[PDB]
Amino acid sequence: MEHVAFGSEDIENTLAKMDDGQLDGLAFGAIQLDGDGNILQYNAAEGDITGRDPKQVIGKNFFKDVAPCTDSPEFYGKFKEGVASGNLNTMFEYTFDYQMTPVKVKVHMKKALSGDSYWVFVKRV
Numbered sequence: 001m002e003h004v005a006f007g008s009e010d011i012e013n014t015l016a017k018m019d020d021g022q023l024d025g026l027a028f029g030a031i032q033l034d035g036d037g038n039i040l041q042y043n044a045a046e047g048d049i050t051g052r053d054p055k056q057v058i059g060k061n062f063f064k065d066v067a068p069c070t071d072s073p074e075f076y077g078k079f080k081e082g083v084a085s086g087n088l089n090t091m092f093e094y095t096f097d098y099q100m101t102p103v104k105v106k107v108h109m110k111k112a113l114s115g116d117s118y119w120v121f122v123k124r125v
């Protein structure tokens with residue numbers, strides 16, 4: 001395990017520039033998106049929660065393609081606002097239900113330090 005807790009205050013610094021293998025060591029799901037929602041990174045813990053294959057989703061659009069249940073004001077709307085302001089930092093519960101048994105999660109979206117990059121962290125609740 002990487003020794004990092006979900007929700008930690010400086011998570012963006014600890015995860016800055018992490019390679020794919022290190023991201024796979026986290027206790028929680030971690031996705032990195034560009035400002036349009038294209039998937040740049042997707043870790044093993046996320047794939048175990050959602051069923052998606054972390055290798056196959058890279059390059060797909062999270063809102064248009066992988067996760068249409070998040071294409072709503074309550075998820076995508078918050079993402080795109082926080083991308084626009086440059087200070088996205090929001091934590092909220094949500095249910096994932098596309099082509100899967102519904103599962104309720106806690107989501108933490110936070111701007112990454114690297115350019116045009118935004119984290120989406122997920123754990124079960």
Ligand SMILES: *C(=O)/C=C/c1ccc(O)cc1
Nearest residue numbers: 050067068069070096098
């Ligand atoms: C709703 O369509 C949610 C889908 C989903 C959420 C998170 C993922 O990592 C993959 C699919």
